[PDB]
Amino acid sequence: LVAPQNTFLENIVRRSNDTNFVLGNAQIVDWPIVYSNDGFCKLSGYHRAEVMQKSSACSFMYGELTDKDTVEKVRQTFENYEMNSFEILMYKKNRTPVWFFVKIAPIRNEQDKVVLFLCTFSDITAFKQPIEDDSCKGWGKFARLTRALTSSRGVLQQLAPSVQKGENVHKHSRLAEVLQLGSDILPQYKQEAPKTPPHIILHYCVFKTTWDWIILILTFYTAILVPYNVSFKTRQNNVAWLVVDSIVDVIFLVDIVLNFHTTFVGPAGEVISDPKLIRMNYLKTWFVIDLLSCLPYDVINAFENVDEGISSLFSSLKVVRLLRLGRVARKLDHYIEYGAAVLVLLVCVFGLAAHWMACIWYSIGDYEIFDEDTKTIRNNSWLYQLALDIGTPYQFNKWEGGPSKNSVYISSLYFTMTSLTSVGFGNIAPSTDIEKIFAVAIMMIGSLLYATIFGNVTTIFQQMYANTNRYHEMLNSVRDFLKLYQVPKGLSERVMDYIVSTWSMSRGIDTEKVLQICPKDMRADICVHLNRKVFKEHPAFRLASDGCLRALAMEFQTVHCAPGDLIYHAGESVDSLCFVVSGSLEVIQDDEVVAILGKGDVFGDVFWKEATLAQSCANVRALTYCDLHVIKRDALQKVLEFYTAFSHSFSRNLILTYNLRKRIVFRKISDVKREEEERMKRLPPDHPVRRLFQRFRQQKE
Amino acid sequence: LVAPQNTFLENIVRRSNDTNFVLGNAQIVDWPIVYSNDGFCKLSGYHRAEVMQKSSACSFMYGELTDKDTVEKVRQTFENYEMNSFEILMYKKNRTPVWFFVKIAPIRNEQDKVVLFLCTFSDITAFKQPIEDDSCKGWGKFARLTRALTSSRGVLQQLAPSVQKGENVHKHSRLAEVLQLGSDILPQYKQEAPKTPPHIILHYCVFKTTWDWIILILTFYTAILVPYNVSFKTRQNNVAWLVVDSIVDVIFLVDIVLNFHTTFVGPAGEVISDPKLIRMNYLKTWFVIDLLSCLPYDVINAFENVDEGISSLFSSLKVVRLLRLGRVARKLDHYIEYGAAVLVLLVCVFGLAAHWMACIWYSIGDYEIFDEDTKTIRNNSWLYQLALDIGTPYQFNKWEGGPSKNSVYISSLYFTMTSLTSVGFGNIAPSTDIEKIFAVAIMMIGSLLYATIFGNVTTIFQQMYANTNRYHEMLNSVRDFLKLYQVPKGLSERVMDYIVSTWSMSRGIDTEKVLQICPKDMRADICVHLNRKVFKEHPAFRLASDGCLRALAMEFQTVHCAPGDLIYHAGESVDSLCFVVSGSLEVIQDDEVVAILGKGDVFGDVFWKEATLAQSCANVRALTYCDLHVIKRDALQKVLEFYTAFSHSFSRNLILTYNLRKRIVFRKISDVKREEEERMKRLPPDHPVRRLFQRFRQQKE
């Protein structure tokens, strides 16, 4: 989410440290100036526009005291493209001769070419010999030159008055700030994305995504396992549990380390990648909590110490890595956001709450069943009830254990579960006060959890139906309109066929909306792409310029059509030129076929010549599914008159297939036979019709 | 929700009591008139427009009989800004000389300045000596003057014919209505919000809001506690319950008093704050109910009287303060309305209904268990069943009590609860007829309550997803369109990058919609703010007037762009001026870099000079993320020709960085070397090409 960016001006101005620079082209003869810094503009007194395009040699800066040897040296250093520095008198706009130190640095290109020359300048007037062509006084001229030397007199040499013979180090101090420009020359005219530090890996790499999926699976597995072991306090018989616990805790610590070594996205900035601040930000935000939550705290339980009862609660506290997950959810859900991702999040929280409240019901029962050394059986307890139900009742002499831990686990799970979805079988009763308060807490939280899933599942029916409903409402309105206004079957089915076909090919595409969203130049490129067919195939466009091509692409509109469609009916005013790129067309003149139109054909009229609109002499009808491109007369004329140069070539190259303004005369064989046989079968009062004949002859004259 | 308002005209006209007044400026020499009342307009006969801007001295009113002493007195009283009153003959528009009483009152300003002079006038003709320059008759002139004196003859002196020598009090009666104007002078030209009475406190103060939160918590606590004590009829063992009950009832009475002393909002008026009506409105609407509901009625139970069984039902009746809360809800919910406030309202009504129906189930059981002195155990009762289930069965000799009240409370709560959410454990059965009807009532109301929460929770998924769905549908349509029309990868990713970046930076912002919602002047201010950058930094605008600045701000449009974007391709018609405020730009001429554009640069053409559009000679492309401001030629020309004065300064100050109409010529070093080595390696039939050469020379001539 970043563009190949160029930063040369900002980089060079920031590296300059209040110095000045001038830029000029390398490959053009005499190397014209392409840029001048504001500092140079003010130092020379000449404006940027008047220094623009001038020669890099700065001959326009020269004066009588300039050195032909220096001129030759700058000339040959330009012609050989090496780094150098110089010292020479130069003339300001007031034609005051003043001293200058100069350095040159041509800049290479990413293509290993060399494109640019870079210049730097500095005053040394207050330190060189005094010179004055004309002055009010020698001391006054000295003071004025020293006050002009403020650039050197500033931070670059502010310590000078505390020392003597400072010129032994002032030259090097000035030269270092220009020698630093070698780093500025590095990008070599290239515009490119900035770099990021190593050992901090981009968060969006596929390897990091599968790492995120792995830590997902790990935290889900730990959230399963933890409440089980902590509730039942089972014996550590197989070392595998401790092995898995320690490895998964250390892999979580490594995950925290990679968050400490990975890119992060902030609300105030699209990408944040500086190690010097990302680590501290991650710390101060959430890294302290991550450290508080993700260590292998079970090592304390594995070891032995005087910390009686201190470290027990670590397991549920470290389950919370689901909260790291929830922070990641903002991104990770979007891989299934299409698909209602929250469905899995629901299922997971269901399972988690079920297991949690299973262990809670177990804990309450276990705490209640025996009344300590008082030996009160408390037969009212649910666990006693289930023990007697399943058999193997308790005994004493000593105590019998009755039910087994596995069966009792599933007992608790199943009660939690039935409470969760309100089926309430009722075989296992919450007899005691605290059992029965816990029943409050569980079924309340269950109902709140329960409402959400109905909302979630309803959230998809809009997608599943509303599009069809939009189609349905337009179709129903069309039906009512069409039937209400009594359109016969032919035109009615033509209308509905057009509606259904165009809707099938379109649906949700808003092509005009996409166009107007698109910015002007990309719009130009899109329409050029869409009219590429006619542009390449028709020879009239083989000569066009890119600008006129773009404008014509804006103007062009493409029409698909069904067979039997009538494009130009007789007597209609022709106003458009049109091309055929698919299908075929036919022309009807006086109910007679006179022309057929195929691929690549173009017909219309010479608008640029006639300049007057005319009626259509014939009818043109489709016989195939055809694609056509049409152009309006006025816009075509405007583009043509703007591009007069292309206009002449376009006029002389373009030839039409048929011209709608002209028409042909003909005779039918049947009509000729009728006339011949009528002649085979074959006036003084006709003076009025003869007068009409004479009038017609005069009009035709 | 009120603006700093001015009411001087309405206030003074209402205080005037049918008198007249005239206003004039204080700080302008000769004090021109700024306003004239309609009464004065009609009394003088001169129209408002012709009296406008005239001198406050009313010299244009004067006549031969006027007094130079009075003229000097009004002059010096104006020059010294004191209050005074006067009497003088003046002339009406018909040039009839008539008597006038006059009073003057300059008005101060909120800045302790003085800005305005106020005048008042009145006729005394019928009481002063008779005067007539020319008349039909003396008695007729007397009658006409008396009929002109109707202003004094009206309500100000209507009692005069019942008295004699009334002039001893008529002057004071007239003067009082003008002396009242001192209160009218109070606001001192200031426009400000009106005042509200003390001891009635604004309802929206933060202290009042936290008071509302406190009364919320109090009524919630009382609603918890009341059905418990009233159902179980527990002994009053700790005085703390009575203490809390009495303090909370009296704090509710104090709350009712503060509603009686606080602002209230009515549908017919945005703010209602008059004590003389707000108290009565609050009374007649709801204050009678508040008094009916909020007293410490438990004092009767604490005391002793012959009122056997009268005062018991007070507690549930005073719980209803949740209805005061519900009236407040219209406002109070909106602090959590963002956040689906109704969720807490649900949770609260849940808890309330649970506890209520707990106490109801308890009441039914307690009423049923024992069949009075008949000693029928009624073992069918649910409470008997639970007693035998838990143990400690009932006994007699005398009666054993069995279950304890705490356990029985939670029993009832828990049954109500399981009935509420239909889990229906079934261990506690409604055996008896009435138990079992109550089961009807509870589970019916439970299902009605239950449906609401699903609606509530579904109400959020639109917010959670529909925005993403809008983005999804446009992206899907773009994908289908782009792939269907076979755009290569380069342009395809350019398009999708533009779409996603613009959508990320925009989302729900409809900037154009905000603009068109905004009214014209604030639109002007917004665009001035947005173009402040160019306005302040570019010297050409340092001279502009506010009106032309506003119009140009309306015209300006800003464009952000990505690197590689081509603004003006070669051969395109230049029609816009444009400025650079961010990033950098580069210019390509004949595939050669010729110019670079930086911060603050401007390029285009001199439209106001050339007046003819021209094609672009070069190409300009972006290398950085850049922000630009563009101006259309036609609107710029129109604004300039309107503001001709600024036009000359703008033309003479403005200088372009590069002009698209002009172009540069150059040569390549490689091309020069090729030509030189070709010359190192180096016509009669050429007459046709020589003729072309001669034609070219003639055309260039």
Residue numbers in the entry:
A (entry chain D), B (entry chain C): 10 to 406, 412 to 696, 704 to 722
Reproduce text from the manuscript describing this model.
The Eag K+ channel was chosen for study because its pore is gated by both membrane voltage and intracellular Ca2+ through separate molecular mechanisms. Four voltage sensors inside the membrane regulate the gate in response to membrane voltage, while four calmodulin subunits in the cytoplasm regulate the gate by closing it in the presence of Ca2+ (18). Voltage-dependent ion channels contain structural domains called voltage sensors that control pore opening by membrane voltage.
The intermediate and down maps are less well defined, no doubt due to conformational heterogeneity. In the intermediate map, the position of S4 is in between that in the up and down maps, the bend in S4 near the cytoplasmic surface is still apparent, and arginine density is visible below, inside, and above the gating-charge transfer center. These features constrain K1 and R2 to lie above F261, R3 to be in the gating-charge transfer center, and R4 and R5 to be positioned below the gating-charge transfer center, thus corresponding to the net movement of one arginine or one helical turn (∼5 Å).
